[PDB]
Amino acid sequence: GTKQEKTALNMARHIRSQTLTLLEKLNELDADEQADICESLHDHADELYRSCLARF
Amino acid sequence: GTKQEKTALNMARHIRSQTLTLLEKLNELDADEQADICESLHDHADELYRSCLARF
């Protein structure tokens, strides 16, 4: 049960995180156009992460 | 000229990358629903990355 499938559940996990941390740092920065962009980004990166959770 | 602004150009850079690498690994995996999800994800993570490039 492939190690390629787990590594991808893993990257998708970590991208779900980075995008939240980035989102957070961009609020701090009142870089708010870009905050908004990263909110979307985070929300599709949990959509993917959870797509991966299921199928895997 | 804040180190908070550079760290965020940096995370956004790296997320642009991970999503491509993830996208690639998910083609390999013929996990194609999820490939499609990550293509979007990549494409908004370059949209953000380049939002950051400008303003910063």
From Swiss-Prot, chains A, B:
Domain of life: Bacteria
Protein's UniProt name: Regulatory protein rop
Keywords on record: Plasmid, Transcription, Transcription regulation
Record text on subunit structure and interactions: Antiparallel homodimer.
Single Gene Ontology MF annotation: identical protein binding
Source organism per UniProt: Escherichia coli
Annotated function: Regulates plasmid DNA replication by modulating the initiation of transcription of the primer RNA precursor. Processing of the precursor of the primer, RNAII, is inhibited by hydrogen bonding of RNAII to its complementary sequence in RNAI. ROP increases the affinity of RNAI for RNAII and thus decreases the rate of replication initiation events.
